[PDB]
Design a protein around this ligand. Structure first.
Ligand SMILES: [Mg+2]
Lengths: 114, 257, 342, 237
C-alpha cells in the first residue's frame, strides 16, 4: 500500500527534529541530519524535499526542520559542517578511550551483577 | 549499483577462456569473479553517496586527491584497470557470436610503431616488450599493474604501479615501493612531485595530468597464479604482450581526424 | 594501412607553408634590389622555343583564373584545427580532442550503472502513462503536499493523510487522474489541436520547451500576459501565423490580412503552477478552453477541467508529470501522422 | 473559494454555441472531452480506517462491550459525555499517519548523535526496484546507516526470532557496530597502504580546515583593529 511505502521512504528515515537551527549555546555533537544533493540535482534545485531549494544556495549540504510551514518556506540552513569535524577526527587517528576503564559499548560482553 | 559489464563472445570466454593466455578457470577468476567482487564492494562503499552516479574512471579522478577516500579510489582504479586489461587481451571486441568468426589477425599499426621508435631511441617493438617484462619483474614485488602510457608530449613510456595505482594521475601512480629502500634519485622524483602538487592553487590540491594508457597488463595473483603459478609471472606477461588485441590498442592512440 | 594517404597531404601542407613564408620575405625586400637585377638578366637572356611555351601558357593561365574569372557566385568535424608538428607536444586544442577520444571509448570501462536516477532522463525519456506505478510517482515526490497549516479544505478528497506536518496526496487517485489527463492530451494532439504548456516557476523552461517540441505545441515560461486569450487582438495579433497540412508541414501559402488577425485560441491549456496563474485559468474559463493543471493541497480543484493531484513545488515531480503528458501527446501526434501515410 | 462551475462544463457551454449557430466549427478538443467526461462532484469523502496503523475510524464501543470493571474498579453502566458527542468531523479529517519505525529512528539517532553527521541523500532512485533480503544488514544498492538497523529490527520482530522490540533492536545494533568497525579499518589501512607505495595528497582534511579558519581569522583581524580604534576615538569624547 501507499502507507507502507511512505513509512520506508527516505523522508520518513529522517527522525523528527525541531531543535533550533540557529543555536548559540554549547555544541558537543551534531543535532541535525545533514542532507546532501548530487551536483546534477543541485542544478535543478532538487534535494528530495517537498519544495525546490532557492537557487541562491550553492552548497550541496543542508540541515532542515520542517518540509513546509505557514510562512510557505522550508526551514533549513545550507551547512553540513559537522561531517568535516568527524572526518578530521578520523584523520588524527586517536582512538576514543574510557577514562573509567568501562567495557567497550560496541561489543556484546557477558556482564554480571557486580 | 555498479554492475559487471557484459563482454563480447561471453559464451566462448566461459568455455575456452582466452586462447594462449588464460584458461576457462583462469578467466573466471580474473573477470567473472574478481570483477564481481570489485563492483559489489564499490557499490557498498558508494551507495547512498553522490559517487554512485559516476563511472569508475570518474570516481577515481574525483577521489584521487582525498586521503580518506583511498579505499573508494582503490576499488575504482582496480575496476577500471581490470577492464582495460581484459579489453586489450580479448580475442575480438566485436561480437562474432552469430558470425562464428575465427580469423582475428591484429597487428601493430604504423602510428604505434612510429611512436615506439621515436620514444625508445629506435628500439623495436620486440625489444620494448623485453623491457616491459623486465620492468614488471624488478619493480612490482607483489600485486600491481604494467602500463604502456602516452603523455602530453606524444612520447610512449612504461609505467608500473603497485597494487591499484592509476596511470592517469601521477600523484597516485604508486610506482615507488617505500616499504623497501629507495635511492637518492627516487627520493628526488618523489620530492619534485610533492613540489608540483603544492604549486596548485585549487582548494582540492589537484594537478593536471594528461597521461593515458595504451596497454594494460594485470599483475595481480587473480590473473596468473591458477594457470602459471608462483614465480612464473614473467611467462604470463610474455604471453599477454604477444597476444594483444591491436584493434583496441591502436584505437587508444589519438590520430586526429 | 592507408596512413600514407594522409601523409601525402601533410607533405603538401608543409610545402605550402614554406612557399607562403618566403613569399612574405620577398614582400619586404625593396624593388630596387630585385627588379633591376632581374630585368638585366632577361636583357642578357634569349628566349627558347620551350621558354616561350610558358610565356603564353602562364599568360592565359593567369588571364583565365585570375582576371577573367568570377570572384564569387550568385575533416568534416573540427575542420579548423591547426595540427602541431610531429616533434612538438600536443596543443591545447589537440589535448581536448585527445580527451574526447578517450571519453567515448575508455572513460566508461569497468562497470555499468543501474537503478540510479538521472534528472535529465525525466524530460528526454518519460514513461508511457500505462507503465506508471505508485512507486514511480512516489519516487518523484508527487505525494508531498503542502503544510497542514496551508490546507485548502476543498482538496480533502485527494488527501491520503498527514505526515511530518504536511498532507500526503493519495497517489492512487493521482495515477487515475493522470491517466485521464494523459488521454485528453493524446486526443487533442491526435486531433490536431493547439496545446499550450504554461509554467512560470524557476527552472521549468527546459521541461516546458521539450514538451512543446515533441507534441508540436506551444509553451510560456516567463509571464502570462493578462488578456492573452480575452484580449488576444491587442496582444497577439501582430505575431505571425502560418498554414500547415495534415503532416504539420508549412504549406507556404501567403495569408490574407483577414486570416492573420483572427484570434488563435489554444485547444488545451496545461498549467504547472495554477496557484500563481489565476489569470490564465479565468481566461481559459471565459474562453471555453479545457485546462489541465497540477493541484496541490492548497490549490482549488474546481478551477480546472482535469486536475492532477500532486506536488507542484518540486521540479522533479512537475517534470515527471509533464513528461508523461508530453509523451502522451507525442503518441497522439505519431498516430495522426501514421494514419495520413496509410 | 466557491466551487466553480464554468471550468468543468466547457463542453456543455460549447455545445450550446454550436447548436444555436453562434460557433460555426466544432473545436478540436470537443470530441476528446465528450469521450472523457470531467469529474464534477467535488465532495468531501468520509474515511473509516487509518491506512498506516489500520486503526478503525468511526467505531463507538458500547457499554455492552465493556462488561468488566475499569482501572478505577468501577463498572461502566451508561454512556459518558464523550460517547454522546457526534464525531462526524473525525471521518473527514485526514488521518495522522504513524509508524513504529519512527520511534526507533528517533532512539537510534539519540543514542548515536554523530550518525547525523554522515550525509544522507533524500533524492530517490526508484522505490520499486528495491529487492532487499533483511536476513542480513548489508544490501546492494543502499548505504549502511541507521535505516539499515531499523529495517533489520523489523525483520527480526516480523520473523518472531525475538519477542521484545528492545531485544531485536539491541541485536541489530551490534550487527551495525561490527560492520562500522570493518569499514573504519578498511579506510585507515587503505590510506596507510597507499602512502607506503608513494601516494601523494595535496591537502588533508585537517589542512583544509586550517586554511578555511585562516581566511576567516584574517577578516576578523581587520575588523577588530578597526572597531578597537573607533572605540578609542568615540570614548575620548
Ligand atoms: Mg505547492
Amino acid at each position: 500500500t501507499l502507507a507502507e511505502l511512505l513509512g520506508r521512504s527516505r523522508i520518513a528515515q529522517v527522525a523528527n527534529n525541531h531543535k533550533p537551527l540557529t543555536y548559540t549555546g554549547k555544541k558537543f555533537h551534531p543535532t541535525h541530519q545533514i542532507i546532501e544533493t548530487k551536483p546534477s540535482t543541485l542544478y535543478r534545485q532538487e534535494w528530495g524535499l517537498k519544495s525546490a531549494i532557492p537557487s541562491k544556495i550553492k552548497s550541496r549540504y543542508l540541515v532542515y526542520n520542517d518540509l513546509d510551514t505557514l510562512e510557505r518556506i522550508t526551514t533549513f540552513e545550507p551547512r553540513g559542517g559537522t561531517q568535516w569535524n568527524r572526518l578530521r577526527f578520523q584523520e588524527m587517528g586517536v582512538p576514543i578511550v574510557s577514562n573509567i576503564g568501562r567495557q567497550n559499548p560496541f561489543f556484546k560482553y557477558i556482564s554480571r551483577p557486580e | 549499483i555498479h554492475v559487471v559489464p557484459k563482454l563480447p563472445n561471453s559464451k566462448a570466454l566461459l568455455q575456452n577462456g582466452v586462447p594462449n593466455i588464460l584458461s576457462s578457470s583462469g578467466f573466471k577468476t580474473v573477470w567473472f569473479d574478481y570483477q564481481r567482487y570489485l563492483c559489489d564492494k564499490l557499490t557498498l562503499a558508494t551507495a547512498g553517496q553522490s559517487l554512485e552516479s559516476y563511472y569508475p574512471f570518474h570516481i577515481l579522478l574525483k577521489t584521487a586527491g582525498n586521503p580518506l577516500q583511498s579505499n573508494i579510489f582503490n576499488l575504482a582504479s582496480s575496476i577500471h584497470n581490470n577492464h582495460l586489461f581484459v579489453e586489450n587481451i580479448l580475442p575480438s571486441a566485436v561480437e562474432h557470436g552469430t558470425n562464428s568468426n575465427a580469423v582475428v589477425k591484429t597487428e601493430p599499426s604504423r602510428l604505434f610503431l612510429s611512436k615506439i621508435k621515436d620514444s625508445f631511441n629506435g628500439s623495436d617493438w620486440e625489444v620494448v616488450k623485453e623491457e616491459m617484462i623486465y620492468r614488471a619483474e624488478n619493480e612490482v614485488l607483489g600485486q600491481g599493474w604494467l602500463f604502456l602510457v602516452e603523455n602530453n608530449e606524444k612520447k610512449l613510456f612504461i609505467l608500473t604501479s603497485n597494487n591499484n595505482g592509476t596511470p592517469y594521475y601521477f600523484p597516485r601512480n604508486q610506482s615507488f615501493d617505500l616499504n623497501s629502500a629507495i635511492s637518492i634519485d627516487e627520493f628526488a622524483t618523489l620530492k619534485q612531485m610533492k613540489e608540483l602538487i603544492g604549486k596548485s592553487t585549487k582548494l582540492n590540491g589537484k594537478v593536471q595530468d594528461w597521461t593515458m594508457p595504451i596497454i594494460c597488463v594485470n599483475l595481480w595473483d587473480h590473473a596468473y597464479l591458477h594457470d602459471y603459478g608462483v614465480g612464473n609471472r614473467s611467462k604470463y606477461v610474455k604471453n599477454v604482450l604477444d597476444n594483444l588485441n591491436w584493434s583496441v590498442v591502436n584505437n587508444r592512440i589519438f590520430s586526429g581526424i | 594501412p592507408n596512413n600514407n594517404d594522409e601523409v601525402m597531404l601533410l607533405q603538401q601542407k608543409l610545402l605550402y607553408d614554406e612557399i607562403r613564408s618566403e613569399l612574405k620575405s620577398l614582400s619586404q625586400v625593396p624593388e630596387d634590389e630585385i627588379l633591376p637585377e632581374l630585368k638585366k638578366s632577361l636583357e642578357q637572356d634569349k628566349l627558347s622555343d620551350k621558354e616561350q611555351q610558358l610565356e603564353a601558357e602562364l599568360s592565359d593561365f593567369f588571364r583565365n583564373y585570375a582576371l577573367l574569372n568570377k570572384l564569387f557566385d550568385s575533416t568534416k568535424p573540427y575542420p579548423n584545427l591547426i595540427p602541431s608538428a610531429n616533434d612538438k607536444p600536443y596543443s591545447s586544442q589537440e589535448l581536448f580532442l585527445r580527451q574526447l577520444n578517450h571519453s567515448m571509448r575508455t572513460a566508461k570501462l569497468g562497470a555499468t550503472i543501474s537503478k540510479v536516477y538521472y534528472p535529465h532522463k525525466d524530460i528526454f525519456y518519460p514513461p508511457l502513462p500505462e507503465n506508471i506505478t505508485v512507486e514511480s510517482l512516489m519516487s518523484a515526490g508527487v505525494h508531498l503536499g503542502q503544510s497542514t497549516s496551508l490546507w485548502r479544505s476543498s482538496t480533502q478528497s485527494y488527501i491520503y493523510g498527514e505526515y511530518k506536518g504536511i498532507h500526503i496526496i493519495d497517489l492512487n487517485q493521482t495515477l487515475s487522474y493522470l491517466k485521464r489527463a494523459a488521454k485528453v492530451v493524446e486526443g487533442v494532439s491526435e486531433s490536431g489541436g493547439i496545446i499550450l504548456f504554461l509554467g512560470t516557476r524557476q527552472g521549468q523552461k527546459r521541461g516546458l520547451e521539450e514538451a512543446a517540441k515533441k507534441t508540436h505545441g506551444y509553451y510560456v515560461s516567463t509571464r502570462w500576459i493578462p488578456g492573452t486569450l480575452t484580449n488576444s487582438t491587442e496582444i497577439s495579433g501582430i505575431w505571425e501565423k502560418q498554414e500547415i497540412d495534415s503532416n504539420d508541414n508549412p504549406t507556404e501559402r501567403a495569408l490574407s490580412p483577414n486570416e492573420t488577425s483572427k484570434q488563435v485560441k489554444p485547444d488545451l491549456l496545461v498549467v504547472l503552477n495554477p496557484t500563481e496563474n489565476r489569470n490564465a485559468l479565468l481566461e481559459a474559463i471565459k474562453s471555453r478552453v479545457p485546462t489541465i493543471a497540477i493541484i496541490d493541497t492548497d490549490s482549488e480543484p474546481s478551477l480546472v477541467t482535469y486536475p492532477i493531484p500532486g506536488n507542484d513545488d518540486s521540479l522533479r515531480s512537475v517534470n515527471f508529470l509533464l513528461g508523461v503528458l508530453a509523451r502522451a501527446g507525442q503518441r497522439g501526434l505519431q498516430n495522426r501522422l501514421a494514419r495520413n501515410n496509410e | 473559494m466557491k466551487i466553480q462551475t464554468n471550468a468543468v462544463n466547457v463542453l456543455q457551454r460549447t455545445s450550446a454555441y454550436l447548436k444555436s449557430g453562434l460557433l460555426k466549427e466544432t473545436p478540436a478538443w470537443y470530441n476528446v472531452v465528450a469521450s472523457i467526461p470531467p469529474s464534477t462532484k467535488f465532495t468531501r469523502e468520509p474515511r473509516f480506517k487509518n491506512p498506516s496503523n489500520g486503526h478503525i475510524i468511526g467505531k463507538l464501543v458500547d457499554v455492552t462491550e465493556q462488561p468488566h470493571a475499569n482501572n478505577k474498579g468501577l463498572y461502566k453502566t451508561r454512556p459518558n459525555s464523550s460517547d454522546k458527542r457526534v464525531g462526524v468531523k473525525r471521518l473527514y479529517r485526514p488521518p495522522k499517519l504513524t509508524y513504529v519505525e519512527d520511534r526507533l529512528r528517533s532512539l537510534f539517532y539519540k543514542q548515536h548523535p554523530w550518525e547525523l553527521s554522515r550525509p544522507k541523500i533524500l533524492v530517490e532512485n526508484e522505490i520499486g526496484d528495491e529487492n532487499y533480503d533483511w536476513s542480513h544488514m548489508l544490501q546492494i544498492g543502499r548505504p549502511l546507516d541507521g535505516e539499515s538497523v531499523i529495517q533489520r529490527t523489523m525483520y527480526l520482530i516480523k520473523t518472531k526470532q525475538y519477542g521484545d522490540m528492545v531485544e531485536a533492536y539491541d541485536h541489530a545494533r551490534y550487527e551495525f557496530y561490527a560492520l562500522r568497525m570493518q569499514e573504519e579499518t578498511e579506510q585507515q589501512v587503505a590510506l596507510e597502504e597507499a602512502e607506503m607505495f608513494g601516494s601523494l595528497f595535496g591537502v588533508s582534511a585537517i589542512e583544509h580546515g586550517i586554511q578555511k579558519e585562516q581566511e576567516v581569522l584574517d577578516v576578523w583581524e581587520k575588523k577588530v583593529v578597526e572597531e578597537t580604534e573607533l572605540m578609542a576615538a568615540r570614548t575620548s569624547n
